Design a protein around this motif. Structure first.
Motif, PDB file in Angstrom:
ATOM      1  N   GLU A  51      67.880 102.252  52.395  1.00 11.41           N
ATOM      2  CA  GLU A  51      67.280 102.883  51.712  1.00 11.41           C
ATOM      3  C   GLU A  51      65.430 101.768  51.742  1.00 11.41           C
ATOM      4  OE1 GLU A  51      67.663 105.213  50.057  1.00 11.41           O
ATOM      5  OE2 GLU A  51      65.849 105.306  49.581  1.00 11.41           O
ATOM      6  N   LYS A  52      65.051 102.642  52.383  1.00 11.58           N
ATOM      7  CA  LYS A  52      63.493 102.236  52.975  1.00 11.58           C
ATOM      8  C   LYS A  52      63.129 102.092  50.825  1.00 11.58           C
ATOM      9  CE  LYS A  52      59.595 102.278  55.551  1.00 11.58           C
ATOM     10  NZ  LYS A  52      58.669 102.404  56.773  1.00 11.58           N
ATOM     11  N   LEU A  53      62.391 100.941  51.236  1.00 13.67           N
ATOM     12  CA  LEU A  53      61.660 100.760  49.495  1.00 13.67           C
ATOM     13  C   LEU A  53      60.285  99.905  49.391  1.00 13.67           C
ATOM     14  CD1 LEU A  53      63.812  98.192  46.713  1.00 13.67           C
ATOM     15  CD2 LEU A  53      63.854 100.728  46.933  1.00 13.67           C
ATOM     16  N   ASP A  54      59.108 100.414  49.606  1.00 13.27           N
ATOM     17  CA  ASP A  54      57.369 100.011  49.506  1.00 13.27           C
ATOM     18  C   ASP A  54      57.525  99.408  48.268  1.00 13.27           C
ATOM     19  OD1 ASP A  54      57.161 100.935  51.772  1.00 13.27           O
ATOM     20  OD2 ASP A  54      56.305 102.242  51.351  1.00 13.27           O
ATOM     21  N   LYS A  55      56.063  98.881  48.589  1.00 10.44           N
ATOM     22  CA  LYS A  55      55.885  97.465  47.604  1.00 10.44           C
ATOM     23  C   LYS A  55      55.744  97.423  46.439  1.00 10.44           C
ATOM     24  CE  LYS A  55      52.828  93.571  46.663  1.00 10.44           C
ATOM     25  NZ  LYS A  55      51.149  93.084  47.121  1.00 10.44           N
ATOM     26  N   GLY A  56      56.981  97.187  45.008  1.00  7.63           N
ATOM     27  CA  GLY A  56      56.669  97.421  44.327  1.00  7.63           C
ATOM     28  C   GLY A  56      57.801  98.006  43.226  1.00  7.63           C
ATOM     29  N   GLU A  57      58.148  99.202  44.367  1.00  3.54           N
ATOM     30  CA  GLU A  57      59.339  99.784  43.975  1.00  3.54           C
ATOM     31  C   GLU A  57      60.640  99.031  43.558  1.00  3.54           C
ATOM     32  OE1 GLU A  57      59.711 102.775  47.516  1.00  3.54           O
ATOM     33  OE2 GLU A  57      58.250 104.025  46.221  1.00  3.54           O
ATOM     34  N   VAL A  58      61.533  99.695  42.813  1.00  4.33           N
ATOM     35  CA  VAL A  58      62.748  98.966  42.372  1.00  4.33           C
ATOM     36  C   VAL A  58      63.723 100.024  42.772  1.00  4.33           C
ATOM     37  CG1 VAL A  58      63.853  98.173  39.973  1.00  4.33           C
ATOM     38  CG2 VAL A  58      61.663  97.476  40.616  1.00  4.33           C
ATOM     39  N   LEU A  59      64.914  99.865  43.222  1.00  9.77           N
ATOM     40  CA  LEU A  59      66.382 100.505  43.240  1.00  9.77           C
ATOM     41  C   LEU A  59      67.532  99.355  42.172  1.00  9.77           C
ATOM     42  CD1 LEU A  59      67.723 102.231  45.225  1.00  9.77           C
ATOM     43  CD2 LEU A  59      68.732 100.703  46.158  1.00  9.77           C
ATOM     44  N   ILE A  60      68.111 100.482  41.755  1.00 10.04           N
ATOM     45  CA  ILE A  60      68.861  99.573  40.803  1.00 10.04           C
ATOM     46  C   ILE A  60      70.457 100.420  41.322  1.00 10.04           C
ATOM     47  CG2 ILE A  60      70.001  99.253  38.095  1.00 10.04           C
ATOM     48  CD1 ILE A  60      67.016 100.655  38.310  1.00 10.04           C
ATOM     49  N   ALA A  61      71.001  99.721  42.589  1.00  9.45           N
ATOM     50  CA  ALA A  61      71.898 100.363  42.665  1.00  9.45           C
ATOM     51  C   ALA A  61      73.586  99.908  42.084  1.00  9.45           C
ATOM     52  CB  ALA A  61      71.828 100.098  44.569  1.00  9.45           C
ATOM     53  N   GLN A  62      75.106 101.072  42.386  1.00  9.88           N
ATOM     54  CA  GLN A  62      75.399  99.693  42.349  1.00  9.88           C
ATOM     55  C   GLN A  62      76.702  99.783  43.744  1.00  9.88           C
ATOM     56  OE1 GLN A  62      77.127 103.617  39.285  1.00  9.88           O
ATOM     57  NE2 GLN A  62      77.878 102.044  37.918  1.00  9.88           N
ATOM     58  N   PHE A  63      77.665  98.937  42.606  1.00 13.51           N
ATOM     59  CA  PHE A  63      78.621  99.123  43.494  1.00 13.51           C
ATOM     60  C   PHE A  63      79.243 100.389  43.700  1.00 13.51           C
ATOM     61  CE2 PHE A  63      78.411  94.126  43.888  1.00 13.51           C
ATOM     62  CZ  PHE A  63      77.720  94.830  45.402  1.00 13.51           C
ATOM     63  N   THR A  64      80.418 100.733  44.463  1.00 17.61           N
ATOM     64  CA  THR A  64      81.038 102.408  44.347  1.00 17.61           C
ATOM     65  C   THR A  64      81.785 102.561  45.572  1.00 17.61           C
ATOM     66  OG1 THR A  64      79.947 103.316  46.663  1.00 17.61           O
ATOM     67  CG2 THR A  64      78.529 102.942  44.119  1.00 17.61           C
ATOM     68  N   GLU A  65      82.608 103.439  45.307  1.00 14.22           N
ATOM     69  CA  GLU A  65      83.716 104.415  46.173  1.00 14.22           C
ATOM     70  C   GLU A  65      83.414 104.258  47.918  1.00 14.22           C
ATOM     71  OE1 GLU A  65      85.367 107.883  45.397  1.00 14.22           O
ATOM     72  OE2 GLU A  65      87.196 107.740  46.905  1.00 14.22           O
ATOM     73  N   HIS A  66      82.662 104.056  48.048  1.00 13.06           N
ATOM     74  CA  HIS A  66      81.690 104.324  49.180  1.00 13.06           C
ATOM     75  C   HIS A  66      81.346 102.822  49.665  1.00 13.06           C
ATOM     76  CE1 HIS A  66      83.299 107.958  48.352  1.00 13.06           C
ATOM     77  NE2 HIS A  66      83.334 108.664  49.838  1.00 13.06           N
ATOM     78  N   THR A  67      80.760 101.795  48.537  1.00 15.11           N
ATOM     79  CA  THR A  67      79.683 100.368  49.144  1.00 15.11           C
ATOM     80  C   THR A  67      80.174  99.742  48.139  1.00 15.11           C
ATOM     81  OG1 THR A  67      78.036 102.615  49.212  1.00 15.11           O
ATOM     82  CG2 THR A  67      77.778 100.271  48.815  1.00 15.11           C
ATOM     83  N   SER A  68      81.124  98.808  49.100  1.00 17.15           N
ATOM     84  CA  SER A  68      81.791  97.900  48.785  1.00 17.15           C
ATOM     85  C   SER A  68      81.236  96.628  48.674  1.00 17.15           C
ATOM     86  CB  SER A  68      82.801  97.540  49.422  1.00 17.15           C
ATOM     87  OG  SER A  68      83.130  97.233  50.749  1.00 17.15           O
ATOM     88  N   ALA A  69      80.220  96.444  50.086  1.00 19.95           N
ATOM     89  CA  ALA A  69      78.327  95.381  50.376  1.00 19.95           C
ATOM     90  C   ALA A  69      77.445  96.232  50.628  1.00 19.95           C
ATOM     91  CB  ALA A  69      79.252  94.821  51.736  1.00 19.95           C
ATOM     92  N   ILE A  70      76.343  94.734  50.027  1.00 18.42           N
ATOM     93  CA  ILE A  70      74.630  95.432  50.427  1.00 18.42           C
ATOM     94  C   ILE A  70      74.258  94.453  50.772  1.00 18.42           C
ATOM     95  CG2 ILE A  70      72.996  96.028  48.483  1.00 18.42           C
ATOM     96  CD1 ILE A  70      75.359  97.407  46.100  1.00 18.42           C
ATOM     97  N   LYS A  71      73.329  94.663  51.765  1.00 14.25           N
ATOM     98  CA  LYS A  71      72.486  93.943  52.280  1.00 14.25           C
ATOM     99  C   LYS A  71      70.646  94.385  52.182  1.00 14.25           C
ATOM    100  CE  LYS A  71      73.166  92.586  56.714  1.00 14.25           C
ATOM    101  NZ  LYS A  71      72.861  91.916  58.227  1.00 14.25           N
TER     102      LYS A  71
END
Ligand SMILES: N[C@@H](Cc1c[nH]c2ccccc12)C(=O)O
Ligand SMILES: N[C@@H](Cc1c[nH]c2ccccc12)C(=O)O
Ligand SMILES: N[C@@H](Cc1c[nH]c2ccccc12)C(=O)O
Ligand SMILES: N[C@@H](Cc1c[nH]c2ccccc12)C(=O)O
Ligand SMILES: N[C@@H](Cc1c[nH]c2ccccc12)C(=O)O
Ligand SMILES: N[C@@H](Cc1c[nH]c2ccccc12)C(=O)O
Ligand SMILES: N[C@@H](Cc1c[nH]c2ccccc12)C(=O)O
Ligand SMILES: N[C@@H](Cc1c[nH]c2ccccc12)C(=O)O
Ligand SMILES: N[C@@H](Cc1c[nH]c2ccccc12)C(=O)O
Ligand SMILES: N[C@@H](Cc1c[nH]c2ccccc12)C(=O)O
Ligand SMILES: N[C@@H](Cc1c[nH]c2ccccc12)C(=O)O
Lengths: 67, 68, 69, 68, 69, 69, 68, 68, 68, 69, 68
Positions: A30-50
């Motif tokens: 997911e691309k974030l531009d300046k000032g945007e906020v993402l709130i992201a869980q761990f999920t069935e498909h995602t066990s690590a976040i870079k």
């Protein structure tokens, strides 16, 4: 299930999800531009976040900053 | 499941997942360049995690640093 | 969902040893860490005790303890 | 499930696991030399743990010291 | 996942007595501790009450208490 | 499941278990002499506990003292 | 299940739900005008949320502010 | 499951268990002499407990005192 | 489930529930006059709540104020 | 399940349990006299509790005091 | 499951249950006169509660006061 907050401090920040399971690869960036906020869980498909790029990050273990 | 935060303080840091089960071996190494952050859980497939290279690490038990 | 231990090797050749869960107790794996490497290791279906040999800085939910070589 | 931390303060510290079940006897003794640490859980097979020898011990109820 | 008690013997011959869970109540085991030894003992399927005789320092989730001989 | 700690401050303290269920009666009385400690759970068979005699008592709500006879 | 609180600090703030699952895409974008508050859960269908525009945000991890 | 501690401050304190269910009446009365302590749970058969007489009471919400 | 408290600080405040599910739309708009308080859960039907108008709001995350 | 503590501060206090379900009505009114304490849970049959009369009340959210007509 | 404490600060305060479910309408209005206290859970039937009239209110998020 727990989550991470990412605030982009510059344009072009990538929040990348890594596959749960026997194999490990990126399935989404997911691309974030300046000032945007993402709130992201761990999920069935995602066990690590870079995070790549300059951002302010919060987790249950406190604040950390990527550059 | 618990997770660990690893922030690489130099290039080439390795975050290494060790297999869950009767067998223990490395199944994956995620390479982090300086200033990248990886937030990684314990899972059905990963019951130990090793970090090599200079990094600032956070877990539920506090801060620890690894050094290259 | 289990507990875990953080082990930071303070010298070369530190061994984090897993003891088998169940009626049989023996070492089933020994993970070698060199100076400054960190291992975050859970208790598991296969590992119900963990032995550290060599000089290391350890964090559990009970706090810090240090092993000495 | 709870665990006990045991740090040997001299050679030959004995960490003794007692059998869970209607019967009580030891089923394993793990000896520690000075400065080694054992982090041991309560388990399906171990419902009481005895420490013999000089050792520094952490549990959820705080620190305690055995004297050998 | 039950609670556990920490018993440190302050003299030789301390007895940590497990009482039977269930409709009937009797001693099913007395573990004898000598001075300076530490027993960490859970409540279990078989033990729903624990009696300490002799001088000991005790920790439980409600704090420290001391038995006297 | 919760437990209470009882330390006898004189001879002959009774720790009495009351039956769980529709019927309420004493099913067991554990005698403590001075300085002995009993750590007793609530159980499938005991849903209330009475202490008679001088004793120092710890529960999750803190310290209470029973006063003798 | 956790939720996030978003107070719009200017007009046209977008709170965007990302789909749970193998696929990741935006399934909804809620527009907030200035001074409106949205309190939004993670759910079966939404496993990441993105805020774009100037807003004041509260989560379990504390306060953070997005900028336009 | 919750419990209350009742310490009798005089003879004949009455701890009264009220029946759980569509009907309400007392199913047991346990009398305490002065200085005796009762530690009693909420259970399948008791969903309210009344205290008559002078007693010192502890619950999860703190200390309260009944007066005769 | 979690709930939110909303106190209307002026007339005609709207507390709006958004449907849980693949689709997101308003299913209900509760109008509060000045001084009224609504204490409202997240539920099987409601997975996001929007407040329009001046109100004082409490959530597990602390206080926030919506403005007209 | 949660419970409320109610201590009557005068004679004739009523703690009223309201029925759980689509229907809301009083199913039981427990009368308390001055000085008595009632510790009452929420239950399968009682999902709201009303207190009429002067009383000192504790719940998980803190102290509150009912005042009589 | 949580609850809310309502103390009426004048006569005729109304504590109103709103129905859980796809439909939101009143269902019950409990009238409290001055000084009366109602302690009311969220339930299978009630997923939101409105207070109308002057009352002192406690929830897990703290004190709030409705105004008539
Ligand atoms: N596919 C791996 C991803 C992973 C999670 N945590 C890790 C830690 C280190 C290396 C890889 C991982 C897994 O689910 O287990
Ligand atoms: N395969 C081992 C890996 C492991 C986890 N924790 C350990 C501690 C020590 C040694 C090995 C391990 C297991 O799942 O149990
Ligand atoms: N195989 C033993 C290992 C063990 C865990 N904790 C111990 C304490 C003492 C001795 C042995 C152990 C078990 O699973 O029970
Ligand atoms: N075999 C006993 C071991 C035990 C646990 N705690 C005890 C306390 C006292 C005596 C024995 C024990 C049991 O499983 O119950
Ligand atoms: N056999 C009794 C033992 C017991 C536990 N706690 C007690 C309190 C008082 C008296 C007896 C007990 C039971 O399981 O219930
Ligand atoms: N047989 C009663 C015992 C009891 C527990 N708590 C009480 C409170 C008051 C009176 C009796 C009791 C029961 O299990 O419910
Ligand atoms: N129908 C959506 C509503 C929703 C909840 N949280 C959100 C965050 C952003 C956008 C939409 C939502 C869902 O249940 O998932
Ligand atoms: N569809 C993805 C969305 C997602 C959640 N957290 C993420 C972190 C990074 C990338 C994507 C995501 C998932 O449910 O897993
Ligand atoms: N039989 C009633 C007893 C009761 C519990 N809490 C109450 C509050 C008020 C009135 C009666 C009660 C019930 O189980 O619900
Ligand atoms: N029978 C109603 C009782 C009730 C509980 N909470 C309320 C709040 C407002 C009005 C009524 C209630 C129900 O179970 O839902
Ligand atoms: N019937 C609605 C009631 C409701 C609860 N929370 C709300 C918030 C806003 C609007 C309506 C509601 C539901 O069960 O979901």
């Amino acid at each position: 299930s727990d989550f991470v907050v990412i605030k982009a401090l510059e344009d072009g920040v990538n929040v990348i999800g890594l596959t749960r399971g026997a194999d490990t690869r990126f399935h989404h960036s997911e691309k974030l531009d300046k000032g945007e906020v993402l709130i992201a869980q761990f999920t069935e498909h995602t066990s690590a976040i870079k995070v790549r790029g300059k951002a302010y990050i919060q987790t249950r273990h406190g604040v950390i900053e990527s550059e």
